[PDB]
Amino acid sequence: VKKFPEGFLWGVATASYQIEGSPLADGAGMSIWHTFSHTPGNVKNGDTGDVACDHYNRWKEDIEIIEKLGVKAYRFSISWPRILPEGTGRVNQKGLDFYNRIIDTLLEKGITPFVTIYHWDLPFALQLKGGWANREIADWFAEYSRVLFENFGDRVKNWITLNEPWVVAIVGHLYGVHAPGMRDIYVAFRAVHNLLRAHARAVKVFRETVKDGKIGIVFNNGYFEPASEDIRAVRFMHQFNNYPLFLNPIYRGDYPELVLEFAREYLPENYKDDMSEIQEKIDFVGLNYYSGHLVKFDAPAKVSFVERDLPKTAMGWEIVPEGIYWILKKVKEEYNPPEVYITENGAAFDDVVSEDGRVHDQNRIDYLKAHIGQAWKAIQEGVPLKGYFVWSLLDNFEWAEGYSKRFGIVYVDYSTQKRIVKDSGYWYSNVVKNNGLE
Numbered sequence: 001v002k003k004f005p006e007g008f009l010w011g012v013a014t015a016s017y018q019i020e021g022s023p024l025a026d027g028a029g030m031s032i033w034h035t036f037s038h039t040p041g042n043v044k045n046g047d048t049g050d051v052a053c054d055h056y057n058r059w060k061e062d063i064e065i066i067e068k069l070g071v072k073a074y075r076f077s078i079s080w081p082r083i084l085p086e087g088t089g090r091v092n093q094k095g096l097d098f099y100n101r102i103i104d105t106l107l108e109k110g111i112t113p114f115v116t117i118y119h120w121d122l123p124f125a126l127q128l129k130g131g132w133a134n135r136e137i138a139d140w141f142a143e144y145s146r147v148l149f150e151n152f153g154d155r156v157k158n159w160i161t162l163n164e165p166w167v168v169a170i171v172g173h174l175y176g177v178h179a180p181g182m183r184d185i186y187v188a189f190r191a192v193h194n195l196l197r198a199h200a201r202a203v204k205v206f207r208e209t210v211k212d213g214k215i216g217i218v219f220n221n222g223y224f225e226p227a228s229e230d231i232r233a234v235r236f237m238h239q240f241n242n243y244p245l246f247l248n249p250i251y252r253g254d255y256p257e258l259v260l261e262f263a264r265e266y267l268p269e270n271y272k273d274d275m276s277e278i279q280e281k282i283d284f285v286g287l288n289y290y291s292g293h294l295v296k297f298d299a300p301a302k303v304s305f306v307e308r309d310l311p312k313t314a315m316g317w318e319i320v321p322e323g324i325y326w327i328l329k330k331v332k333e334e335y336n337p338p339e340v341y342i343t344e345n346g347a348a349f350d351d352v353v354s355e356d357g358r359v360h361d362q363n364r365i366d367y368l369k370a371h372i373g374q375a376w377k378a379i380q381e382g383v384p385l386k387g388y389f390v391w392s393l394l395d396n397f398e399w400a401e402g403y404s405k406r407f408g409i410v411y412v413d414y415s416t417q418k419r420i421v422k423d424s425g426y427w428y429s430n431v432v433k434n435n436g437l438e
């Protein structure tokens, strides 16, 4: 058996735009994902977050599912434009009401809320003023964060400033695949820097407003292996694509060496002037992890991926469970944060409801079991892993892939909004109840 420490936090995770629908209900302002998905050509099949899982209406049922499964923590995000429809200034009480009911319900049921302040649904009003490209977003984000802390910090004690700021910056502003759909490398690196500045101002506000809680930040991470002996190409991908891009500034006061070699010209001229503020102390690091990549020197960043004959998910992502052990070891070794969480881990497979009314996702069980086992390993070797969150509770709007990719441990029939707990959800409930694997 593999038992986890007493009090280890087993959770599930979602994000507001991916599950809620009703993006303009009850006085909410448009987000950049509303306007991006409503632009033809940006999302597969023309899918949008208009309805999604209708969590805006079905939230109680969904939390009752979390409760029924015995899951101990729920990581969810707040829609900024539901709270401040123009991004700054006016606060929308109906938006606060929506999350207040979710928080109170979770607490009543003994489930720990972990709140992601920003999971990509920037108010459209702020995008008109440059969004993450504008230095002033450090202020806008601090004002937003302060509203959340003032209204919710009496009850929510676990906070995440940003989800996957690399994706926000690079996929949103260089690749143009995500909102706001731009392709400018100078804008993309300004966004990196402003994400750090905004993250740090929010932590600063947090210390002033929620004197008894904890706050951290969440990064996407891949396991990059070298194709041969381009072991530097691996070094660059780690430093650029993984936690170092942000943690080197937070813990060491500068970007990683190979990031600076690639991107110095694209950063503001006097970017170091902001580093002392960026070092604002954080309480934990959240790492997301899905996939490994074989990398060789080559390509726009002098790096290309090499395909491998390994099992893959429906995303085409190679399944490399040891990657989660590696990234956990590596973060301790490099920055030694006081606490770590796996804030997302999961897989998309082509789920089908069998004639027996069940979803027999053995592929997903195998994926999660392998990764949980590797996380356990990291714990045995001294990594202060405090929790593990499965992405996701529900099949949902998977960004530019729309509804075509299902990551839930609960199946959603979008024609009816019926929820069907998958075999993986049942399996996970047992893991949680047992506090580990058997």
Ligand SMILES: OC[C@H]1CN[C@H](O)[C@@H](O)[C@@H]1O
Binding pocket: 015, 018, 163, 164, 220, 288, 344, 391, 398
């Ligand atoms: O692509 C799967 C997930 C990757 N991480 C993001 O936080 C989440 O929103 C995505 O659905």
